[PDB]
Short mmCIF file of C-alpha atoms in Angstrom, two decimals:
data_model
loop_
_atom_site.label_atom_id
_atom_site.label_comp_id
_atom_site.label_asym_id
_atom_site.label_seq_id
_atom_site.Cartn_x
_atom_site.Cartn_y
_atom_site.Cartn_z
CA UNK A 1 13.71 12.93 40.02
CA UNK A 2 14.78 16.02 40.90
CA UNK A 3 13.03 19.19 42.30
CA UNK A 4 14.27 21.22 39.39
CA UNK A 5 12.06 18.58 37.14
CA UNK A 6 9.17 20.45 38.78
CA UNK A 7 10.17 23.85 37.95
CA UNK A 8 10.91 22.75 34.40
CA UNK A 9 6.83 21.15 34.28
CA UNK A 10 5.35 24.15 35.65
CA UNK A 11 7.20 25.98 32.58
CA UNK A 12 5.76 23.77 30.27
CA UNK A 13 2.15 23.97 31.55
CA UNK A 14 2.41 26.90 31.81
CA UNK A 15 3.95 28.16 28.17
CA UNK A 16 2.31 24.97 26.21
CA UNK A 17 3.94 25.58 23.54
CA UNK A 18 2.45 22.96 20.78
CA UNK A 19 -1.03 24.79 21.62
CA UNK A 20 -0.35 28.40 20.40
CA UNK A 21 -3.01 29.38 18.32
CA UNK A 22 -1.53 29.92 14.82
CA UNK A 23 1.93 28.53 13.76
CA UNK A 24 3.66 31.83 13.36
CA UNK A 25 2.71 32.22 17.34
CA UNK A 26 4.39 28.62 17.50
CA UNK A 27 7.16 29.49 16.20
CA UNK A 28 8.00 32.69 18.11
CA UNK A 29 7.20 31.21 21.22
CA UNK A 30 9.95 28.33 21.21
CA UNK A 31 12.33 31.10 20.07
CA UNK A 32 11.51 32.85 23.20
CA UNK A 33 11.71 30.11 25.26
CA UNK A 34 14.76 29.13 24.44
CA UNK A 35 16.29 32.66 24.72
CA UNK A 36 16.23 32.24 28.27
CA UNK A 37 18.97 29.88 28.32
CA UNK A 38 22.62 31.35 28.89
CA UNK A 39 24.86 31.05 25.33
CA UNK A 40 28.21 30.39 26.47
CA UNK A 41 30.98 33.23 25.26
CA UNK A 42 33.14 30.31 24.10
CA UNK A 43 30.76 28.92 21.57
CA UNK A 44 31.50 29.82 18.37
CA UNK A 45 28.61 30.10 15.43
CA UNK A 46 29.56 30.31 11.83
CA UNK A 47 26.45 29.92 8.95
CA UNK A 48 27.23 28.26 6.46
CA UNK A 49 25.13 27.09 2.66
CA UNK A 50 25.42 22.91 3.77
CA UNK A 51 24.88 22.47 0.00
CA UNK A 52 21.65 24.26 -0.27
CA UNK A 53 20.39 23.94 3.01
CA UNK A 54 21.54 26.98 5.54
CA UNK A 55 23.52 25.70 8.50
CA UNK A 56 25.65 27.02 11.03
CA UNK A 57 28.92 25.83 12.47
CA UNK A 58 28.70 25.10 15.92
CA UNK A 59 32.00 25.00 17.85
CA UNK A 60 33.57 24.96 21.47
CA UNK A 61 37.08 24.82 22.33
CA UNK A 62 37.95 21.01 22.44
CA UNK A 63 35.95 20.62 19.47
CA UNK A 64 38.09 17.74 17.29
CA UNK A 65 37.62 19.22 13.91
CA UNK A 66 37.47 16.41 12.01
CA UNK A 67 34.40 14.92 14.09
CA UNK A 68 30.90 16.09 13.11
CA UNK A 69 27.39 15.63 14.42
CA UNK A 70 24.62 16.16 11.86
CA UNK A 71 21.68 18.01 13.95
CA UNK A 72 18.56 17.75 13.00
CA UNK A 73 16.52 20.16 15.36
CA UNK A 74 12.45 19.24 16.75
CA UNK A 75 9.55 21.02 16.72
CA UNK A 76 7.14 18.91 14.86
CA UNK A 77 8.08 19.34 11.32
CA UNK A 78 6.79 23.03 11.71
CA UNK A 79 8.83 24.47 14.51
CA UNK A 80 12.58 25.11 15.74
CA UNK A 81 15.47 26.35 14.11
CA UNK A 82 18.79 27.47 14.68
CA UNK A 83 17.94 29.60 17.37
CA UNK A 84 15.93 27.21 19.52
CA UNK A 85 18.19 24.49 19.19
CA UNK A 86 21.81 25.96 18.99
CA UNK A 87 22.24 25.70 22.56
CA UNK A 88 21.21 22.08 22.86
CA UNK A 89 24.36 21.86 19.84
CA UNK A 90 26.39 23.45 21.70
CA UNK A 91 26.12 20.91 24.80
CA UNK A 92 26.62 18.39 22.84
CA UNK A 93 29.59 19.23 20.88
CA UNK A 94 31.07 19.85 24.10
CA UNK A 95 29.96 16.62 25.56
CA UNK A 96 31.03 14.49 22.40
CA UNK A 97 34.19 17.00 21.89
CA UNK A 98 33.23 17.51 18.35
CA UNK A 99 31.67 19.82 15.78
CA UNK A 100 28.09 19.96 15.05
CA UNK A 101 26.08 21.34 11.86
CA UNK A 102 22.78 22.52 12.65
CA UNK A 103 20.66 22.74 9.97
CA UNK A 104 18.04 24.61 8.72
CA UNK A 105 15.92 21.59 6.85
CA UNK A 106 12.67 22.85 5.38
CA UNK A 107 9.53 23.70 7.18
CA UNK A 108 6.06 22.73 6.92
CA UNK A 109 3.49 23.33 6.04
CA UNK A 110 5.10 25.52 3.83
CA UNK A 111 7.49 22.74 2.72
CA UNK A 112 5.61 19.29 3.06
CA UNK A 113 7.17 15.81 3.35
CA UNK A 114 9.85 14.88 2.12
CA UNK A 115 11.45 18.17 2.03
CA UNK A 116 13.04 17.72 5.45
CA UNK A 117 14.36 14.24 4.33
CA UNK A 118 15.74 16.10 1.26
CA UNK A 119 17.77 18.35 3.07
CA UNK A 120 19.00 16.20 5.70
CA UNK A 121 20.23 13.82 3.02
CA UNK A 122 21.71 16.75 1.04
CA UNK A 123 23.56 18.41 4.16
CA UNK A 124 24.89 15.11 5.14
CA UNK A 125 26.18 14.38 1.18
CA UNK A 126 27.71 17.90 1.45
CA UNK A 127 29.58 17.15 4.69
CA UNK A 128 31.51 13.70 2.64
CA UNK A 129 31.49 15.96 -0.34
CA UNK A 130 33.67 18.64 1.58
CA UNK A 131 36.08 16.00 3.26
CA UNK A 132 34.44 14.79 6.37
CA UNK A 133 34.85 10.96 6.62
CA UNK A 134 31.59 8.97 7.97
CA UNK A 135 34.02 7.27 10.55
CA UNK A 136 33.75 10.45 12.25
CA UNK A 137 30.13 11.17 12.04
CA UNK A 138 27.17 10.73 13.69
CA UNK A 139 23.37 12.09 13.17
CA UNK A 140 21.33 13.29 15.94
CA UNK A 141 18.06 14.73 16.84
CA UNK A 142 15.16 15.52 19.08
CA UNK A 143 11.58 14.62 18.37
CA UNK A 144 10.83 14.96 15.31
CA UNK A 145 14.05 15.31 14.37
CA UNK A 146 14.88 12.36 15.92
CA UNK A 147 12.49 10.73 13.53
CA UNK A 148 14.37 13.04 10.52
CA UNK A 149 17.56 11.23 12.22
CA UNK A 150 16.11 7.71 11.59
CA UNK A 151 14.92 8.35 8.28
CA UNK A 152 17.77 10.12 6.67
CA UNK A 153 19.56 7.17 7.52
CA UNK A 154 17.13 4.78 5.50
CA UNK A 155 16.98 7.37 2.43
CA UNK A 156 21.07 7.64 2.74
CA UNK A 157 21.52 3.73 2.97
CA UNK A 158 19.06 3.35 0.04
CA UNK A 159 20.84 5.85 -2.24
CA UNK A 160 24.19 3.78 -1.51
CA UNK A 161 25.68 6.34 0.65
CA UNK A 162 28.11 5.03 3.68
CA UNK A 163 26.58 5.59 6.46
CA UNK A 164 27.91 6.99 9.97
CA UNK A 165 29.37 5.40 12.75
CA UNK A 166 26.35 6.12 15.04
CA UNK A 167 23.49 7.71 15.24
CA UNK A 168 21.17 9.51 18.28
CA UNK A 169 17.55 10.05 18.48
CA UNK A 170 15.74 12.56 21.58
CA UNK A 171 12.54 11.61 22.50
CA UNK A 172 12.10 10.47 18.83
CA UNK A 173 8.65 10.80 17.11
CA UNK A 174 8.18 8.16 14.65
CA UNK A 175 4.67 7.29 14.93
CA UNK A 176 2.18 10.22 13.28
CA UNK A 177 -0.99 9.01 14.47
CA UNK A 178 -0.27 8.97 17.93
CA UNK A 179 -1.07 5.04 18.32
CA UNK A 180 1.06 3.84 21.14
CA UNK A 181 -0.23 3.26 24.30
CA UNK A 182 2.07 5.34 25.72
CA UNK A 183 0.10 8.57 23.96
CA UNK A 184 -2.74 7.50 26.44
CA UNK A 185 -1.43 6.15 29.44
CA UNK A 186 1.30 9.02 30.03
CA UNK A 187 -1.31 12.04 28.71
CA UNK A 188 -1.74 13.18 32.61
CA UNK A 189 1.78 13.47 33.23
CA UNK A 190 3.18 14.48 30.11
CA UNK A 191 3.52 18.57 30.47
CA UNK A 192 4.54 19.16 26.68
CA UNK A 193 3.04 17.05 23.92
CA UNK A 194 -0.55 15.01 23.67
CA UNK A 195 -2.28 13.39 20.76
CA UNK A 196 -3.98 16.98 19.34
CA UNK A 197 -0.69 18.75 18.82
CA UNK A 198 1.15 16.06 17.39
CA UNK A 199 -1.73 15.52 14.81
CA UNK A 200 -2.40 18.97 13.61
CA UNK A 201 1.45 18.77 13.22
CA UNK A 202 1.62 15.61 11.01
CA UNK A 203 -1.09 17.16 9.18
CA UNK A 204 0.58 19.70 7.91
CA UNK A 205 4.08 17.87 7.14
CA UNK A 206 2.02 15.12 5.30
CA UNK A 207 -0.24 17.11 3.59
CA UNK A 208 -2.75 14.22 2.76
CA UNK A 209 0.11 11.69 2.77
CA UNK A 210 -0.39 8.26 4.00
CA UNK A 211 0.46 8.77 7.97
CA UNK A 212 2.80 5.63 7.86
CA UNK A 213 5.03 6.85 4.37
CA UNK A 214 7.75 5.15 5.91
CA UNK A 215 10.27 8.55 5.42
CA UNK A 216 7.44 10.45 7.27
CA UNK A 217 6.90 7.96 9.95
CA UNK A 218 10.02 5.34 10.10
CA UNK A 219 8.06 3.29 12.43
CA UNK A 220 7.37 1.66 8.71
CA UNK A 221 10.94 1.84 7.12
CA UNK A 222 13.24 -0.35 6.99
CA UNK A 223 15.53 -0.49 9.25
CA UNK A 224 18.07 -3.09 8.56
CA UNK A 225 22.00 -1.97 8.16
CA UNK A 226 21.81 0.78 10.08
CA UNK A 227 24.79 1.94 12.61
CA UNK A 228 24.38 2.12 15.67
CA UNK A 229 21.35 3.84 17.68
CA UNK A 230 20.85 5.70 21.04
CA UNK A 231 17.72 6.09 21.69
CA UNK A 232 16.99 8.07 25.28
CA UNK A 233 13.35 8.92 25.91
CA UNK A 234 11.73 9.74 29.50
CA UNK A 235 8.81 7.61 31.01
CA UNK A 236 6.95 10.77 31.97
CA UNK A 237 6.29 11.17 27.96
CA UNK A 238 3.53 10.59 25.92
CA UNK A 239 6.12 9.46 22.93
CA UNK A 240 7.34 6.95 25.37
CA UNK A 241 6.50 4.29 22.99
CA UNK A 242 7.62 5.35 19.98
CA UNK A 243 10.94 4.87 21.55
CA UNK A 244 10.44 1.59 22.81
CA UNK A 245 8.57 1.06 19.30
CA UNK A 246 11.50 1.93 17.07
CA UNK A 247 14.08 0.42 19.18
CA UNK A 248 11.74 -3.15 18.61
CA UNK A 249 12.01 -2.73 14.86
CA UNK A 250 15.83 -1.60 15.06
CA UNK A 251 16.63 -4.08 16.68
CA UNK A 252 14.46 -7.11 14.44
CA UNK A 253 16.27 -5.50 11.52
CA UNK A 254 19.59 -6.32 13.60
CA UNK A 255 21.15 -2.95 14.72
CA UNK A 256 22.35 -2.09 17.59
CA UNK A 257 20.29 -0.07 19.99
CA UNK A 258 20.85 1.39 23.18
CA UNK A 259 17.46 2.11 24.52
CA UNK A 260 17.59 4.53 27.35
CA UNK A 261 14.10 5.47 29.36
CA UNK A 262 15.42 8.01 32.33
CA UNK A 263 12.77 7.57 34.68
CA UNK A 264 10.05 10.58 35.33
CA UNK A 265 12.12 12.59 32.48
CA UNK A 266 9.60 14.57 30.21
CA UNK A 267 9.96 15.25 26.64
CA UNK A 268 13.76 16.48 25.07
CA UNK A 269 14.69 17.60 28.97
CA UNK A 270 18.34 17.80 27.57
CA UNK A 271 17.17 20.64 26.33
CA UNK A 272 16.87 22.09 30.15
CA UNK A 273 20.45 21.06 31.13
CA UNK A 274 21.00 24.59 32.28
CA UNK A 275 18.81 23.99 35.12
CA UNK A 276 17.31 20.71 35.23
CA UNK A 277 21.01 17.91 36.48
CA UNK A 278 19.05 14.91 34.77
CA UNK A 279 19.27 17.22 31.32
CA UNK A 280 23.36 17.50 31.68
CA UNK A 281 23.73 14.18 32.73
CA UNK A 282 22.08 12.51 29.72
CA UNK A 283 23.79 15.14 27.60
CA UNK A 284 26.98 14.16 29.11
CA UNK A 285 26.07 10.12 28.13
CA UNK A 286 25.03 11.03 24.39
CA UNK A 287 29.13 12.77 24.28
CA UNK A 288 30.12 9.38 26.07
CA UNK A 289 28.39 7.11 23.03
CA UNK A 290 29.49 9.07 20.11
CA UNK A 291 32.94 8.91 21.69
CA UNK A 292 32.97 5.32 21.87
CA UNK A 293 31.74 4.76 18.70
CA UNK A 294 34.46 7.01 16.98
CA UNK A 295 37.29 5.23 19.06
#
């Protein structure tokens, strides 16, 4: 991989940022982290009420505006927002030449499961409601929001909703007890997420909910009739087998994944694309996907 990956770990282990001490201290410190990355001048932000959910508009100049991505940010359940993750929009709608609504889907523990699922769903009805055409769309997201991606996608099939013409996940979690063997074998080298974390996070988006409530954890949904998936995960990642988990089950339920493991990649290193090459470059192959699939 290369050198820059290092720079990027020593951040990490440094920072640790699923092992702040309360979540308010969480939440502040992905918000400073991902201050440090440069906001292009050309983006342009506009919020927006995404039928009850607050959004923002995120644009670039060859945005198509009749092409939208639905982002559904990581952190957990209990972290992100639009801050953190607005840059990681950006990238892509310039990648994928598109818009992008980034939401802001409920937090927990304040706002348990299924709240998240709720306001996916509803952002993503809004978007057909106010004339975008599913032909055209896509839903994507990082960790957990990459599981968010995967089940939005079950609730919206199940409620008769057309779906999208693809979908993406980022280093998707799926799996909320932390089960694979990946969560393990890939501890030591892993500089961002380990069994602890991800548990005292499920914990508090359950709230005493079975761990494998298939919206929570889509590892157990159902799968079948979904569009199709890109799934990119790194091998230096403890959630390294919740990708190759989900893409298993995608693919039994006959969709069509792409399952991507970059080699020695650690978790959602798109979102270091200002400084780490492997981050742009798999950025640049998620805008190459949803482009194909909208031809």
């Amino acid at each position: 991989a290369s050198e820059a990956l290092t720079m990027i770990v020593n951040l990490l282990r440094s920072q640790r940022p699923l092992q702040e001490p309360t979540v308010e201290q969480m939440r502040a410190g992905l918000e400073a982290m991902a201050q440090m990355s440069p906001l292009p001048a050309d983006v342009e932000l506009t919020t927006v009420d995404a039928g009850g959910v607050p959004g923002a508009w995120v644009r670039v100049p060859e945005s198509d505006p009749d092409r939208v991505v639905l982002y559904l940010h990581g952190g957990g359940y209990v972290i992100g927002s639009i801050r953190t993750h607005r840059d990681l929009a950006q990238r892509i709608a310039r990648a994928a030449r598109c818009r992008v609504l980034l939401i802001d889907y409920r937090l927990a523990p304040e706002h348990p499961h299924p709240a998240a699922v709720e306001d996916s769903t509803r952002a993503y009805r809004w978007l057909l409601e106010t004339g975008s055409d599913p032909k055209r769309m896509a839903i994507a997201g990082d960790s957990a929001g990459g599981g968010l991606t995967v089940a939005t996608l079950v609730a919206l099939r199940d409620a008769g909703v057309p779906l999208p013409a693809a979908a993406v996940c980022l280093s998707p979690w799926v799996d909320l007890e932390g089960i694979g063997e990946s969560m393990t074998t890939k501890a030591a080298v892993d500089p961002m997420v380990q069994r602890e974390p991800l548990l005292r996070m499920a914990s508090m988006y359950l709230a005493g909910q079975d761990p494998r409530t298939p919206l929570a954890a889509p590892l157990y949904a159902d799968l079948r009739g979904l569009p199709p998936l890109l799934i990119q995960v790194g091998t230096a990642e403890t959630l390294l087998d919740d990708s190759v988990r989900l893409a298993e089950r995608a693919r039994a339920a006959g969709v069509q994944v792409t399952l991507e493991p970059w080699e020695d990649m650690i978790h959602v290193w798109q979102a270091f694309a200002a400084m780490l090459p492997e981050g742009q470059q798999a950025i640049e192959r998620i805008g190459e996907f949803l482009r194909q699939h909208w031809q």
